[PDB]
Amino acid sequence: MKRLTYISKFSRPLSGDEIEAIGRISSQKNQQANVTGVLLCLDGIFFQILEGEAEKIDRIYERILADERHTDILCLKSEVEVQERMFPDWSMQTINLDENTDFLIRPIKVLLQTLTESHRILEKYTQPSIFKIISQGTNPLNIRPKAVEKIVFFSDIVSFSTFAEKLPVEEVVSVVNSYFSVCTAIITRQGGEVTKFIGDCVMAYFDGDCADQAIQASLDILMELEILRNSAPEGSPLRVLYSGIGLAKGKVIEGNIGSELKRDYTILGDAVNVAARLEALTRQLSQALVFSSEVKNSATKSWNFIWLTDSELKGKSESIDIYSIDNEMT
Amino acid sequence: MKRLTYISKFSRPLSGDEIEAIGRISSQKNQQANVTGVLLCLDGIFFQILEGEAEKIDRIYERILADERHTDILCLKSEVEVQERMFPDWSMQTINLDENTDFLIRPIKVLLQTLTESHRILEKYTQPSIFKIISQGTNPLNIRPKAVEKIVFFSDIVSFSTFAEKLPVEEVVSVVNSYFSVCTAIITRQGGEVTKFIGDCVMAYFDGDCADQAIQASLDILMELEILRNSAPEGSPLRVLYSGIGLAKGKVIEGNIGSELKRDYTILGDAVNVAARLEALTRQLSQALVFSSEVKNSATKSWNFIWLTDSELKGKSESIDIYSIDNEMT
Numbered sequence: 001m002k003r004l005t006y007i008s009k010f011s012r013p014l015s016g017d018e019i020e021a022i023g024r025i026s027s028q029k030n031q032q033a034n035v036t037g038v039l040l041c042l043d044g045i046f047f048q049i050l051e052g053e054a055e056k057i058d059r060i061y062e063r064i065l066a067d068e069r070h071t072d073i074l075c076l077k078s079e080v081e082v083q084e085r086m087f088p089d090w091s092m093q094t095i096n097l098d099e100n101t102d103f104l105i106r107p108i109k110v111l112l113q114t115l116t117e118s119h120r121i122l123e124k125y126t127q128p129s130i131f132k133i134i135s136q137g138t139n140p141l142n143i144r145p146k147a148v149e150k151i152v153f154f155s156d157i158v159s160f161s162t163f164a165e166k167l168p169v170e171e172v173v174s175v176v177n178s179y180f181s182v183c184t185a186i187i188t189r190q191g192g193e194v195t196k197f198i199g200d201c202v203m204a205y206f207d208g209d210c211a212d213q214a215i216q217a218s219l220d221i222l223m224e225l226e227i228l229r230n231s232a233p234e235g236s237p238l239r240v241l242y243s244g245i246g247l248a249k250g251k252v253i254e255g256n257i258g259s260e261l262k263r264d265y266t267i268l269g270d271a272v273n274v275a276a277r278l279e280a281l282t283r284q285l286s287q288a289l290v291f292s293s294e295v296k297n298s299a300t301k302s303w304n305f306i307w308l309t310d311s312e313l314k315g316k317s318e319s320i321d322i323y324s325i326d327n328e329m330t
Numbered sequence: 331m332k333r334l335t336y337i338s339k340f341s342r343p344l345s346g347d348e349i350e351a352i353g354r355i356s357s358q359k360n361q362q363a364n365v366t367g368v369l370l371c372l373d374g375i376f377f378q379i380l381e382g383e384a385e386k387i388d389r390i391y392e393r394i395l396a397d398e399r400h401t402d403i404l405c406l407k408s409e410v411e412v413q414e415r416m417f418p419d420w421s422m423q424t425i426n427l428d429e430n431t432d433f434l435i436r437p438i439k440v441l442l443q444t445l446t447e448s449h450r451i452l453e454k455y456t457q458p459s460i461f462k463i464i465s466q467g468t469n470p471l472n473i474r475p476k477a478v479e480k481i482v483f484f485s486d487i488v489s490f491s492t493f494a495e496k497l498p499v500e501e502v503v504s505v506v507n508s509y510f511s512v513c514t515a516i517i518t519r520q521g522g523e524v525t526k527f528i529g530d531c532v533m534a535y536f537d538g539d540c541a542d543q544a545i546q547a548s549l550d551i552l553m554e555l556e557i558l559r560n561s562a563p564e565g566s567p568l569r570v571l572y573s574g575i576g577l578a579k580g581k582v583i584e585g586n587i588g589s590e591l592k593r594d595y596t597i598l599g600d601a602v603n604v605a606a607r608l609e610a611l612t613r614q615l616s617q618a619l620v621f622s623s624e625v626k627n628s629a630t631k632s633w634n635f636i637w638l639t640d641s642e643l644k645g646k647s648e649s650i651d652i653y654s655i656d657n658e659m660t
């Protein structure tokens with residue numbers, strides 16, 4: 001048995017009648033799927049618990065994400081191997097807390113709103129990776145550090161200083177946020193984890209045996225930015241949004257890093273400086289993407305590799321072979 | 331009138347009897363101070379609402395922080411200028427939800443635990459500055475970017491690469507976390523805001539007219555690390571924990587930066603690269619602290635300034651006068 005808890009936001013103002021309609025249909029369909037649960041709403045926020053056979057639940061849940069009347073769905077907990085039903089009497093018990101006024105529910109419905117309002121804000125400042133760990137019943141703070149091989153991704157906007165010196169504050173942030181949004185969307189799509197933003201820089205990493213997906217994310221980013229530049233409106237600052245990209249491979253420490261007040265779940269190691277160094281080299285070369293031979297050697301597909309003879313790196317241990325992809329972009 | 335909501339963790343296992351004892355005494359003292367509220371507990375978590383005259387509330391609250399039976403106090407909301415009492419009938423109404431079993435409270439007490447467990451984890455990955463903004467009724471995501479003068483603080487561990495190459499993974503993280511903890515404690519104490527950890531680096535900033543407090547935090551850090559090195563156990567890696575420090579002043583953008591999935595409330599601008607550049611210069615000089623003349627010119631106290639003739643900076647616009655403090659440390 002699987003039990004699923006989640007929360008969402010009202011996509012549009014719903015009346016107490018529309019909510020009841022959802023509960024009724026939900027009750028009918030859950031009655032036949034041998035599913036039980038409870039649906040609660042409070043000042044434009046939905047809360048639902050859903051329990052039953054994992055297969056049947058997976059079906060119902062993915063259909064709930066299709067529902068237009070709510071958005072910002074976030075699953076707080078996914079229990080597997082459950083043996084007991086929390087609410088074996090209710091196929092769907094709807095509880096509109098906005099109308100309930102029992103004196104004992106009053107202190108609890110206030111705290112619930114306060115805790116939820118705060119939670120939904122912390123989400124935006126939190127990495128989506130932590131939420132997945134929490135949902136699985138693992139406390140990410142209790143994770144012990146470990147050494148692991150990763151592909152480190154570094155990309156940095158070209159000559160961002162001029163933007164700040166010639167554009168209003170609102171437009172600079174708009175340019176950098178658009179860039180971060182494009183990078184994050186493609187990296188996450190290829191399995192990458194965006195760990196840190198460093199000024200106008202994106203820091204990310206891939207599994208150590210995923211060099212093909214790091215190269216493909218890099219290439220797709222460069223393609224997306226070229227379409228972005230050519231399709232931007234007239235006089236838009238996005239027309240001159242260029243980036244470099246550097247990829248390196250190496251053994252890094254992954255784990256909780258920081259102080260008692262704040263910490264990050266990120267990586268640490270030499271491969272970070274190499275990736276950063278390589279990204280910087282793109283300013284000198286015509287190629288916007290450069291990577292080490294350990295990345296090139298870890299790829300499984302037959303990329304159009306080009307061997308670059310500009311390995312003037314500093315701070316490393318020995319010589320490093322530099323590579324790029326020879327295509328219309330680079 | 332002021333209404334105060336907060337949550338805390340049981341410092342030790344409390345029985346339902348000890349809790350009732352807290353409520354009773356709380357009721358007696360709140361009855362005379364014209365104070366009303368509600369105290370709720372759930373699986374080792376306290377929740378309390380407190381409302382009344384701001385002065386009387388401030389007194390009660392600071393005494394509650396003195397109570398040893400709970401810890402990790404975090405105020406979720408501080409309403410000021412309140413006109414209505416939420417619970418005008420209860421000086422202190424205690425509700426032990428662990429024992430309550432009303433069928434209607436059951437779905438709500440589960441969600442409450444799930445939301446709280448998650449919240450308390452997100453706190454550790456969240457900057458304490460966001461929580462203060464949320465408590466005041468301001469949504470930090472709706473804050474618009476602005477240009478502002480700041481003193482940027484940069485400090486970086488000296489030769490951290492050797493630590494990773496010669497110590498087990500657990501001890502490296504222990505060394506960097508101890509360093510981050512020392513830096514954060516002193517910076518926060520002097521009014522500074524620690525915004526980002528960049529590998530073995532601490533990035534922080536001060537108000538633009540607080541150069542004296544940035545210099546004093548820097549000096550105190552260097553003193554703390556010297557005591558840490560001399561007092562460490564035998565063969566401890568903390569004996570060789572050294573840091574550099576760079577301070578710069580300039581106009582930076584402050585605001586929400588990132589993508590739709592994750593964003594940071596941080597700064598951006600040239601002063602960041604200058605502070606980072608200055609910190610790096612300490613590797614060449616005997617002084618562990620260096621700062622620009624704009625920092626030196628913004629100080630109000632009569633520091634023992636020393637004018638450094640090593641302004642070989644790169645990437646800047648023009649020459650930059652370098653300064654340090656001449657004392658037993660540097």
Ligand SMILES: Cc1cc2nc3c(=O)[nH]c(=O)nc-3n(C[C@H](O)[C@H](O)[C@H](O)COP(=O)(O)O)c2cc1C
Nearest residue numbers: 022025026029030037046060063064067069070092
């Ligand atoms: C917050 C929210 C919760 C919902 N929960 C359920 C549920 O638990 N079970 C269910 O069968 N449908 C649920 N639905 C509705 C489904 O998304 C979908 O509309 C329904 O299954 C399709 O109904 P139909 O059989 O008439 O096509 C929910 C919708 C919303 C907005």
Ligand SMILES: Cc1cc2nc3c(=O)[nH]c(=O)nc-3n(C[C@H](O)[C@H](O)[C@H](O)COP(=O)(O)O)c2cc1C
Nearest residue numbers: 352355356359360367376390393394397399400422
């Ligand atoms: C979660 C928790 C909540 C408390 N809430 C209150 C309160 O609302 N009002 C109050 O007067 N004391 C409250 N106290 C107790 C005070 O911290 C303190 O012990 C008490 O005011 C001192 O009692 P005394 O007058 O016998 O010295 C609380 C203690 C704990 C652990």
Ligand SMILES: Nc1ncnc2c1ncn2[C@@H]1O[C@H](COP(=O)(O)OP(=O)(O)OP(=O)(O)O)[C@@H](O)[C@H]1O
Nearest residue numbers: 157158159160161198199200598599600602603606
């Ligand atoms: N060492 C650093 N550590 C952290 N953040 C930095 C550092 N240097 C710069 N930044 C941040 O990055 C922003 C852009 O600096 P950057 O070095 O990328 O310049 P640029 O004008 O974009 O040129 P380039 O083409 O060399 O990248 C700076 O305003 C600052 O916010």
Ligand SMILES: Nc1ncnc2c1ncn2[C@@H]1O[C@H](COP(=O)(O)OP(=O)(O)OP(=O)(O)O)[C@@H](O)[C@H]1O
Nearest residue numbers: 268269270272273276487488489490491528529530
């Ligand atoms: N450009 C960079 N951007 C972000 N993080 C970096 C960068 N370079 C290094 N790091 C991180 O910082 C860690 C330490 O690198 P760093 O350059 O500080 O070397 P170090 O051995 O501590 O020497 P130093 O005395 O020069 O500081 C690296 O392992 C990596 O985790």
Ligand SMILES: [Mg+2]
Nearest residue numbers: 156157160200
């Ligand atoms: Mg740049």
Ligand SMILES: [Mg+2]
Nearest residue numbers: 156199200201
């Ligand atoms: Mg940069």
Ligand SMILES: [Mg+2]
Nearest residue numbers: 486487490530
């Ligand atoms: Mg270092």
Ligand SMILES: [Mg+2]
Nearest residue numbers: 486529530531
């Ligand atoms: Mg460093």
